[model samples]
Target: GIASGKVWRDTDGNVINAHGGGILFHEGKYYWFGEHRPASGFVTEKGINCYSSTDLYNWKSEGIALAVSEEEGHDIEKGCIMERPKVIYNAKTGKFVMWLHLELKGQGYGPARAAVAVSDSPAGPYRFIRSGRVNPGAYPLNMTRKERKMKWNPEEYKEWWTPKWYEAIAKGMFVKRDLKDGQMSRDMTLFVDDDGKAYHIYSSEDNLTLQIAELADDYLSHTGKYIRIFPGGHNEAPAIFKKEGTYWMITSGCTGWDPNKARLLTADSMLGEWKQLPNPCVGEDADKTFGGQSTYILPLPEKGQFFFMADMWRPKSLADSRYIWLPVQFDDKGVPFIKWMDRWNFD
Candidate 1:
């Protein structure tokens, strides 16, 4: 076993540059998609980088699966910010859909929109389809009638961190504010359940809450069935996985480029109540998530094993960020935990 967070290299002997990535197993091969960074600083010059690997040890660069747009004013135009490129296969439509948290060029994350691209193949030059907020003017199915019928009078709320502010927030104040342009989407993850239901899980409400929105059968658009969880929880960098009929989610605090204690939530159903649990890490520096942020949780289909993947980011040169991948171990009581391993792998 090789040390995980000490600059992992690919088969060709080059450092792997997939930061804030997501992995998709398609056609019996694993494709990892992530931000391709510049050594000098954070910039989007190319696009979402791709790597193909049959075994996890050996990775072959597939180049940019989706290239940055050349056209002006494009959602993914050159210099636009794109992070967390997640790909999911659409069995019914025969398409591979890619979703990323996108920001307009030079906007400094003010737009906070989601961009969608599609490709015929997993490792592809994906065609940019559309980029915008999801399900604008539509209310989340979980929005209560009281929330939906809420008439926002901004003057009623006077202070932050008070019951009045929270009540207004619970009454769809942010949802009503963004009704014309859709909600702010950032730090996202994509999950496809066993029942062929796809859901887009993202940090919305300016990263103060997490929303899980259902994807249409085609897996290209939202079905408007969604719910906000832990509003004002200020959680981001969400990584989700399901095991033994339970949905588990791990999220980090909204600290830019800094790792914080991860929050674990579990639910009997994906769209149901999620009870928050303690931090799942159980080793040195566990509070820092082992010096990384939650990116994804990888599961081995045949072995019934799951692994947590994260990035130990170096903001000065994002390309230098390393990966922290550790096996997800279970207790006799069925609770899960992650232990930092200097060197380990699935055997």
Candidate 2:
């Protein structure tokens, strides 16, 4: 509405402290759900924040849509880790479903689980349903016969960052690592197709690759029909959108809090065989993704435009993360690119 990369504020005159956010459009209103990052580091304090707006600008506070837990030993207890929360509405079920990247409490990043919640209303005190790694003991539908037959020897691949380790990773070592349990689900997004089907796309394989899993009819759980993409590709921060008839995704490299060059991928179906494209960014310092990381791509309904939502993060002061929302432009060849805009709105 004003400057594209400036600090946006809500109607309450507070800086919009939403990072790694996603958008949900429902009943003439747009809801922005994001991580409620405090001034501290990546710690869970206030949980997921929600804001609402009828117009693209001037959001009003809707409070925390989902909150951290208080019960001891609870999966999402007060000090637990949750990130990149995305929500979708199930028309048939008439309920709002939320999905989040869940890390184990006090265990650092070892537990890369996916959490689910449900609420009757959009702005909600969502009820916690369950949290676990996705699709335990299930191999992807797109697994190759050899890949499926590849033996898993945990002892041989003990080391990391080596050529040997890298080769094993490229060969679905992490998939084998969790083959007995489940695949890691981190840095995720929720995509709803035109036919009312939804899917959870995330960074799996120890954040070395991406997986797209089909959501159940109620949108509360996975249907076990999923596929791994770009194995050992080290892609995270997945943002997805459906355009015309193709599924397009924008993701960031696994560089922790720092920004890296962005990745663009497209697929005819949500399942397998996604072709990776070049960085969708252009202009000065485009290789650094304009100093931001991809979060979610917002589609402007009733118009043929989409906004690329990214985080210009300041890890030292987590609350100071600035949003970089730019309109998606295209070339004559129908390829998408994003350019830095000081300020813009749909006129």
Candidate 3:
């Protein structure tokens, strides 16, 4: 039985420690990769942990797929903050690609780098590729030419949270600020489209906006083709899925470990215009996303099943954060909604 908001043990009878992760189904089993939190504090200790499961009910720890580097000043130096690790398979390269939000050691979330790694096997010791801001010197595809030329003085907008300030944000204020360097990326997820294309969805602009950047064919680097959605919307913790030719994303507000209202966005294409809809959660605690933040929306294409995956964070003991896996139900209008459940089975 799969129980939401309860301690789940792996096949070894050890508590499943993979948090803020995503799943990839390859061969005949599913691979789960996520941050392995320390016993108490917030800093990352053990790198990304891996788990395998034939049936979604019981999982087996496959060891750390990507271990933190021991080298000094490395992008993923041990004890640095590594979070929201999502993995996707690159058929052309025959490799599994993993991207995660990486903050430098002792930097306290200053860098906002998106790190990449590769592994030959589904569950493996992923090799670190590189980590940095996204698209060092490129503009979003959606930004108009005139908008790109327009500029604003940072001095006037120094005071934050004003309408004009938000307009500046929407008008590429931060984009221009990071133009020479790459844009900041945080709290991200990966989505592979039906056309074999991959896109990186992440929180950008100091978590005031969400950006979807297209990945290269190899799925290692960004192609510089991207778009910003809901500027100044203050969204994070993105989880994306596609159904019936429509791409859907569920995201959380920028409230740190505390859960907030979940947001739903839809688009006909991955890089197309996205429209916001009402909260997709129903029942008690629905307003709070059942007291959890989205990490991934797991879709079983073969079974025609979809599960809303989230993490109920325990700030006092992050290692104790519980997993929330609720079955995603669709209304008669085909809008996805999640309902809380105490205990559930796939039957």
Candidate 4:
């Protein structure tokens, strides 16, 4: 059955204000984290809000898992915007790790950062470890004057052949490292597989491209080459998962501050050719996606069942936006389909 109505509401009887969020499954409970905003306000105060659910219905607000900093030097203090928070349990360390797309004061697109937090419990008063740009160093191509000029207009003939061009080497092409100076990380998601190897997927090049890199055993450094997932450049905000032997990814179109149609992709392997699927939504109002944009896809423990979550943003009033969660089902032929409904429950 498709979702049919609101399963949970805020204290005021309105839909919860969490937007651009992710779900965490811990110890037989589901914790939902996202950017929570006030009901009425132009001022943007985004912090990580947590809600707990057992049967995917009847959520209980757990309050702020990660609070915004008030101190000046703290990156979150200067009016930070946090989005797409996903948490996972580390079996070795026995801790809950939270990751989100973070931005410094004033929505600074100058440096898109990823913030990390940790807590002992799922309902956490999580502590922020740090925030920094994800890129490791200056673009190797940005080192030389001729190369810098070529970046602006690569098609120029004169800029193509030169002594400086000969001196330039591609040796330092995005060597991944820990957070250092002048690097940026933004719009990131963590995917943990059945075998427990978690990978980090994010958008770079101004959300024009998607990159997937394997995280180190510690879940920090990038271990392998960053593979380009979609060169056609049709999507961003990638949320990936595997079902049976098939790989599935959900992504949104490149429309800043505006909700657009979402697309699904299927592949046989993680680093293989991917096939784009049709829009997952159904019914008459499905094209507009119930006035929302794709953010995360939650697959139930059972085979071939999923919940596609999205944000129906009120951009003019970012805090007043609503959340939409729909069911993704499969037909007799085993083809996947996403149908829109007013609300849904697991039990």
Winning model by TM-score: 3
What's the lDDT for all of these models? Answer: 0.87, 0.88, 0.91, 0.67
| Each model's total of backbone clashes | 0, 0, 0, 10
Q: On a 0 to 100 scale, what is the lDDT of residue 69 in model 3? A: 89
Q: State in Å the error of residue 225, model 4.
A: 3.8
- Candidate 2 clashing pairs, residues 3+ apart or interchain: none
User: By descending lDDT, how would the candidates be arranged?
Assistant: 3, 2, 1, 4
TM-score of candidate 2 against the unseen true structure: 0.97
Q: For residues 198-223, could you state the per-residue lDDT of candidate 3 as single tens digits?
A: 99999999888899999999999999
Worst lDDT window (10 residues) for model 4?
Answer: 169-178
Error of 2 at 178 (Å): 0.3
Per-residue lDDT tens digits for candidate 1, residues 88-140, read 99888999999999888999988888888899999998998788887788887
**Which candidate gets the maximum lDDT versus the true structure?**
3
TM-score for each candidate, following the candidate numbering: 0.96, 0.97, 0.98, 0.80
Candidate 4: the clashing residue pairs are: 3-343, 4-342, 4-343, 5-342, 5-343, 133-183, 133-184, 134-184, 134-185, 135-184
Cα lDDT for residue 300, model 2? 81
Q: Taking the tens digit of each residue's C-alpha lDDT, what string does model 2 give over 85-137?
A: 99899999999999998886898988999999999999898999999999999
Candidate 4 per-residue lDDT, tens place, 1-347, comes to: 23433334744465665677888787888888887876665334658888887766567788888888889868777377777888877777788888887877776576677777889999899888877655454432223454334332224323522644222212111222221353345677888777667777777644544656565565644454345555335477677667778878888787776767778788886656667888766777666666777778888766456777777777667666766777778768655667766545664
